[PDB]
Design a protein around this nucleic acid. Structure first.
Length: 159
DNA sequence: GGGATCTAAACAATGC
DNA sequence: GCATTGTTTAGATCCC
């Protein structure tokens, strides 16, 4: 495990590698902290047009990497929540699931021969049909709850 | 359980 | 190792 196979470098690292070297040239003091600090800054300040193809480098990396190694590979070096976390804070209900809940009684209405779990399948195809603007309110609702959820996970980190 | 998208802790590497 | 932020991973999310 110590000689763990290197995980596919995320797009940030790709950029960081060549950028850091250039930065060392341009910046006279080139302090590790200072170089990297603004380095990450510029990255997130970059345009998505730049991110996309950089992300593709990482995507191709992980694609070949994951298939290459059958068993030996990056395991989630997590921590307490490495296994099934008994008391993980409850995330905001997913927009899809919110829509599913709303249509659940309706689906059985369409066909009086569906198990409650099977009604989700109906939602699945309607999910694609659902207009982005129409589904947006649900997602926003979850996003608002997400802020609340972060407080919950913060409590998890420290009471 | 059930489809079908989602989340957060932790790690991923360069050049000093 | 640092700091930056991105991919990792594997449960997690609805009602009945």
């Amino acid at each position: 495990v110590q000689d763990r196979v290197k995980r596919p470098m995320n797009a940030f690292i790709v950029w960081s590698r060549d950028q850091r070297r250039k930065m060392a040239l341009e910046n006279p003091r080139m302090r590790n902290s200072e170089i990297s600090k603004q380095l990450g800054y510029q990255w997130k300040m970059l345009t998505e047009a730049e991110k996309w193809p950089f992300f593709q480098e990482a995507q191709k990396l992980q694609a070949m990497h994951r298939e290459k190694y059958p068993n030996y590979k990056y395991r989630k070096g997590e921590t307490k929540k490495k296994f099934k976390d008994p008391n993980a804070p409850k995330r905001p209900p997913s927009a899809f699931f919110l829509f599913c809940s709303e249509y659940r009684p309706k689906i059985k209405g369409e066909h009086p021969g569906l198990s409650i779990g099977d009604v989700a399948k109906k939602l699945g195809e309607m999910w694609n049909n659902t207009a982005a603007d129409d589904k947006q309110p649900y997602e926003k609702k979850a996003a608002k709850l997400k802020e609340k959820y972060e407080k919950d996970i913060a409590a998890y980190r420290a009471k």
